[PDB]
């Protein structure tokens, strides 16, 4: 499992 970048959840 890879961790998402700090902004991966931003539109």
């Amino acid at each position, epitope marked *: 499992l*890879l961790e998402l970048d*700090k*902004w*991966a959840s*931003l539109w």
Partner: antibody
Amino acid sequence: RITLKESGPPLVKPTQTLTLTCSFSGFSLSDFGVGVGWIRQPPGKALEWLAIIYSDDDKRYSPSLNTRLTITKDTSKNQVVLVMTRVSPVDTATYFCAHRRGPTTLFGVPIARGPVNAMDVWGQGITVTISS
Amino acid sequence: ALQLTQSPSSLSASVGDRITITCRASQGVTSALAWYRQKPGSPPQLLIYDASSLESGVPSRFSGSGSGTEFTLTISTLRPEDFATYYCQQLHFYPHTFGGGTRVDVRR
């Protein structure tokens, strides 16, 4: 307008601690979501991501080097430091620091991710050799 | 870590040529992909950010495309200062990773 410069020792002995400093101008680590990262390039090889720290003190390290790396910042001095412990000749490389934009903000509000997907300004780079 | 595969690893071309480099990701990274140009003895220079956005100040001859797992960088008209090494980088997952690079030399 943005300039970054790496400083540190050009030669270090195996098992020692390497401390690299990134001094910059043109931006503030107080800028919302801004990041300063470190990337190394060993002789004749590709770029290798090392770590990144953000305006909010959030930080990440390459998982395979996480036990030997520590990244810090001093927002009042426009500097970011990368410390690497127990170095070995495998660590010989040219080290670069680089700026990462925070997201587009409108009157303070973060409205777009786009700009953060890249390291837009890199320092000149410092070549560090590890040998006894 | 997320794997990026650049291709070709090496390419020979001539001034005025049109070249295209691709980068394939082991999995989707949405549009979080950047392209850089690196001249010998110099640091990387940003060309494209967020997969297809042209970095301010970069010549119009550079363009990028893709989203998900396939990406391409295109140089409409090769210029002398363009013979160098290019790298892709994904910033969707930690650790951020770079492709192996693509060197472009003067052909003969």
